[PDB]
Amino acid sequence: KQKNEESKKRQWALEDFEIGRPLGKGKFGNVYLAREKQSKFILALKVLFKAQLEKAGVEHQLRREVEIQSHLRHPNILRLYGYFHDATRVYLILEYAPLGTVYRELQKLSKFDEQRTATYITELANALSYCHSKRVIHRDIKPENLLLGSAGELKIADFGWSVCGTLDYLPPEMIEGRMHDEKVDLWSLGVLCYEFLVGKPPFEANTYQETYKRISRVEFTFPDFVTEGARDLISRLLKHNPSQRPMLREVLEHPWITANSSKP
Numbered sequence: 298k299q300k301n302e303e304s305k306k307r308q309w310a311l312e313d314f315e316i317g318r319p320l321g322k323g324k325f326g327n328v329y330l331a332r333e334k335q336s337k338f339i340l341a342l343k344v345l346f347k348a349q350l351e352k353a354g355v356e357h358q359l360r361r362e363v364e365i366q367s368h369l370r371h372p373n374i375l376r377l378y379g380y381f382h383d384a385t386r387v388y389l390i391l392e393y394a395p396l397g398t399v400y401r402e403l404q405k406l407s408k409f410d411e412q413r414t415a416t417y418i419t420e421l422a423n424a425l426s427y428c429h430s431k432r433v434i435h436r437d438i439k440p441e442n443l444l445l446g447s448a449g450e451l452k453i454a455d456f457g458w459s460v461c462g463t464l465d466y467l468p469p470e471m472i473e474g475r476m477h478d479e480k481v482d483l484w485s486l487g488v489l490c491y492e493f494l495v496g497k498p499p500f501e502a503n504t505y506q507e508t509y510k511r512i513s514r515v516e517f518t519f520p521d522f523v524t525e526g527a528r529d530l531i532s533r534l535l536k537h538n539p540s541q542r543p544m545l546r547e548v549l550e551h552p553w554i555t556a557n558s559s560k561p
């Protein structure tokens with residue numbers, strides 16, 4: 298299912314694949330379902346236009362991110378099989394996550410129950426701990442960049458790595474131009490946790506400027522249905538002071554998480 302091949306190579310051409318239905322769209326590329334002709338392996342092929350990548354000044358980010366990603370082997374991170382190119386465009390060979398994005402699940406369910414939410418948060422904390430363990434700090438984490446495996450397991454799908462768009466998930470130190478460390482994504486978990494339970498992120502607003510101020514001020518409120526344990530956890534993660542966010546160990550041990558996650 299996931300342990301295909303570790304020898305990533307660039308002798309792949311478009312003629313190796315039968316192309317299927319469009320899976321999603323982004324600014325630069327379309328992602329398609331695809332099947333490798335020889336093996337019949339189902340995967341997703343994301344197609345990005347080279348000229349657009351260079352024009353936007355992100356091609357170097359892509360080379361470095363691909364190189365990093367090729368090293369990451371983890372059940373809650375989408376596995377990257379390889380890449381190649383022709384004259385017009387650049388092709389990324391990605392794991393196919395059949396149950397789709399958490400974003401769509403949120404749109405379909407309106408909000409998640411504490412069980413879905415705490416399972417998702419455990420999976421994210423595990424994945425970010427693994428990423429942090431190899432010097433790979435993460436940028437923002439969006440429900441759009443969370444996929445679901447055949448058993449409903451979460452897969453981190455965004456390239457927010459290191460050796461923007463909407464800010465909803467960015468911590469103050471990332472938006473105020475301050476210094477940021479691995480604690481940025483702890484902020485991200487609080488934002489995602491809130492959105493999972495509530496159905497929108499804690500600082501959502503009609504305009505970018507309003508949102509900027511709400512994040513900077515940490516101006517958010519809890520609806521009544523949000524339980525005492527979740528309020529406490531979100532409040533621990535959504536701290537202005539990076540130094541005040543917990544370690545991932547502490548997150549995984551939080552009594553609301555331990556009492557609510559469905560992860561055997």
Ligand SMILES: Cc1ccc(C(=O)N[C@@H](C(=O)Nc2ccc3c(c2)/C(=C\c2cnc[nH]2)C(=O)N3)c2ccccc2)c(=O)n1Cc1ccc(F)c(F)c1
Pocket residue numbers: 320321322323324325326327328341343344391392393394395396397398400401439441442444454455456461462463
């Ligand atoms: C901010 C952001 C968000 C998302 C991406 C991103 O690309 N995810 C890739 C992806 O979806 N894989 C994938 C694999 C198997 C799947 C599915 C999806 C799926 C269903 C589906 C689709 N849609 C809702 N459900 C299904 O059933 N099986 C992807 C790669 C290339 C093109 C499109 C998607 C991302 O890069 N960014 C960063 C970003 C980019 C451009 C900006 F301008 C910006 F500001 C920020």
